[PDB]
Design a protein around this ligand. Sequence first.
Ligand SMILES: N#Cc1ccc(Nc2nc(N)cc(-n3ccc(CO)n3)n2)cc1
Length: 272
Amino acid sequence: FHKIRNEDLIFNESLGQGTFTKIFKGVRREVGDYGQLHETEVLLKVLDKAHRNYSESFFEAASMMSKLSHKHLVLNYGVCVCGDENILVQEFVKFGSLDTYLKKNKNCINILWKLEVAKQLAAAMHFLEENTLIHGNVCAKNILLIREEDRKTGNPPFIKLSDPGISITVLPKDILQERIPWVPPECIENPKNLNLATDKWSFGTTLWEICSGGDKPLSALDSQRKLQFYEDRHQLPAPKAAELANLINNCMDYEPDHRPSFRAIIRDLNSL
Ligand SMILES: N#Cc1ccc(Nc2nc(N)cc(-n3ccc(CO)n3)n2)cc1
């Protein structure tokens, strides 16, 4: 990663928290193309100092994805590791993460918006699958909205997939259980089962979020009951707007080997 000096970064408002992290809007002073000086809006993602022992996984999350370049993958500018900080410096996305956007905007998101977003997520995942790169934490909180839909110019919304954060292969068991039903059953059984098929299951859970106005699937279940949901082999209820329910359930297959390729997922979306 490119190294960015702390002197060149200004922290502004908090934008929320992730697992062992806090996110802020900020500004980076930099020399850009043609030698022009810029003050660039950035997302600053800060590893909690109490959890500095996760720093390798925290950065590994950003690194492997940054090794590929793609229009639907978030841009990482660099890292700041001055002093006692562990900071990832990422492009600032104007409309934020999709979980929040969906909850705020339930009433004006229709089936065509959901389908376009699903197709774009599936394109990003097909790119990862073709490169045999595991993401490991597909969820609406890790989808960023670059551009809102504009009917008045026929313009679709445009999303990017952000980094997965610290890997489920190193996280505490109780955090994994709280992340059911994004973490697939085989990874609850053994987090080293993380595989390309993991991302197909989580993609189904993410489609359910997209279809459910920002609701969290199984939120009313505590961790014990989320575990038993897997033990009993349940599927999620169909969203009220159920156009994608079959695809969600086909992706959320308890047999990892039976989960469909992202090419087949795309063909299915294109058929609707
Ligand atoms: N109101 C408001 C508002 C909130 C956030 C943004 N911008 C943004 N830009 C990014 N590159 C990443 C994120 N994230 C948000 C959650 C995560 C965890 O994945 N990231 N948010 C813009 C407006």
